[PDB]
Design a protein around this ligand. Structure first.
Ligand code: GWS
Ligand code: GWS
Lengths: 304, 304
């Protein structure tokens, strides 16, 4: 019993973290097989960061200008190329710690573990959601860039996120491992407002199922609702509209708990309309939206 | 910027996790040098678990009855002994992944990372506090026992916690790595009520400093207070009394932010007396007490 914002075990990712230095700027790289993936803003200087001409900047850089250090051993860089907003540095050595891995572009609402890194060294790990507005609410300083998000299916590490920039609002933006930004963000030093952030309704419901499973049930009411009723309430409170897809994905939690999805929606509806009246659910005084139905099933059954 | 309930990178601990099986019961072991540390209730059967005579039970067990498996290779067990509530299984092979480590008994209020494990396999990692009543609010199922808590100072893993039992209230109890329970708990199948849990006041203050640093400051007021005034308010609300020690430890956050500790106490006082009025601090609708002043400094500066 008990329920925690649990991150994936970070060991398989630790073994892939390197330091990347170009001119003066240092940040993190991801060493998989004989390629190191890092943010392309590694090649920038403070005078460039306004509106960097990454193509013109990269012309001026040679394999020898990319200092790649794994612990206390340097990697020889035999190739460099720019794919969208990441650099691929071909090195002469395969990372002997390369886990089974894929590159996956996650969907907003989907969760992942971040291993925050500085100078290619891990500092810690936490679980995150891709916000509906394609931002993450991270813990990232100068030198945390190139830290990656991931999921792990048994032995396969799915890399979904590379950290690039912090918005003036203090929220985080980043790319997939093909260096495509999640959201409209560009790697520049300009004000870039994040759209309206909605609450990930299906994740709140999944978390309400986790609560019931772990014995927090005071919020179960004698009401039901309809997708269309519930969604009128969702709109008001900037929740994502609930679809039959979302309901289908909650089926395992519905089946286990025997609480129909639309009944739980009616619990959610009442919590939105009346607040929590100074009570808590799984040690939280607000509605947690960063556990997927998958996350709840995994943790509540103990998948490894 | 941003602030997260961050766990230590779990890789150094993953490499120490094994499976321990005695009779039918399976749970987790910790393989360091040529010793495997596991909960002694591994030797119990469901008929024993009421009031187990661990000494008499252990008589009946031989080195060959302790099946110790690291991934898909068995360890030969050349010795077994009981220290308090853990078993030390001497194996013929040193764990080649043994990190630098110590065994440290933590103080209540101190935090640590848990790597929850099943069948010697990691499932995930989260940050925890030893509650003032020597319980932890974990995420642990059947087979999670022998999962360990830890801190990491650069390269040294300090093991502080081994998970043993869940109380009927669904809160967790466990030992240091010398198998001494934190708190009054015994490894039996009896109702064992946990004392009153207080809020770890110094950690809330440290978290209030983290909030101010990350730009959440709406709770800063024009008031101050005194240790003795503040502590009258602490009592009412079951906060731990604040001491000069606690104030001394907040000095780095006070100095950085230039907000005297007793001023922040006066912020805390008002939050206790008036609640949060439906606002949030670092994405929380209640007062977080599971970040130490050390934790806040580490994360806000980015120690690795
Ligand atoms: O965002 C920047 C600088 C950006 C990076 C992209 C190019 C313009 C400059 N640094 C940073 C700081 C804290 C957390 N994350 C990232
Ligand atoms: O607590 C028990 C059984 C206790 C263990 C000690 C001896 C009496 C039996 N199992 C469990 C379940 C979930 C999380 N943690 C532990």
């Amino acid at each position: 019993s008990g329920f925690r914002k649990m991150a994936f075990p970070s060991g398989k990712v630790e073994g892939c973290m390197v330091q990347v230095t170009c001119g003066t700027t240092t940040l993190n790289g991801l060493w998989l097989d004989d390629v190191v993936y890092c943010p392309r803003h590694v090649i920038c200087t403070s005078e460039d960061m306004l509106n960097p001409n990454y193509e013109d900047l990269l012309i001026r850089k040679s394999n020898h200008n990319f200092l790649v250090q794994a612990g206390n051993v340097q990697l020889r860089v035999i190739g460099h190329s720019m794919q969208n907003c990441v650099l691929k540095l071909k090195v002469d050595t395969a990372n002997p710690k390369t886990p089974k891995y894929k590159f996956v572009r996650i969907q907003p609402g989907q969760t992942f573990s971040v291993l925050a890194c500085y100078n290619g060294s891990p500092s810690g790990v936490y679980q995150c959601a891709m916000r509906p507005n394609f931002t993450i609410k991270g813990s990232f300083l100068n030198g945390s860039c190139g830290s990656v998000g991931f999921n792990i299916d048994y032995d396969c590490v799915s890399f979904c996120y590379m950290h690039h920039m912090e918005l003036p609002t203090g929220v985080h933006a980043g790319t997939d491992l093909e260096g495509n930004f999640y959201g409209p963000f560009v790697d520049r030093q300009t004000a870039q407002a994040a759209g309206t952030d909605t609450t990930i309704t299906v994740n709140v419901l999944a978390w309400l199922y986790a609560a019931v499973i772990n014995g927090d049930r005071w919020f179960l009411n004698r009401f039901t609702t309809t997708l269309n009723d519930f969604n009128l309430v969702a709109m008001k409170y900037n929740y994502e509209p609930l679809t039959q897809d979302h309901v289908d994905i909650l089926g395992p939690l519905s089946a286990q708990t025997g609480i129909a999805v639309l009944d739980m929606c009616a619990s959610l509806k009442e919590l939105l309309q009346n607040g929590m009246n100074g009570r808590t659910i799984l040690g939280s005084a607000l509605l947690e939206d960063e556990f997927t139905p998958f996350d709840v099933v995994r943790q509540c059954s103990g998948v490894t």
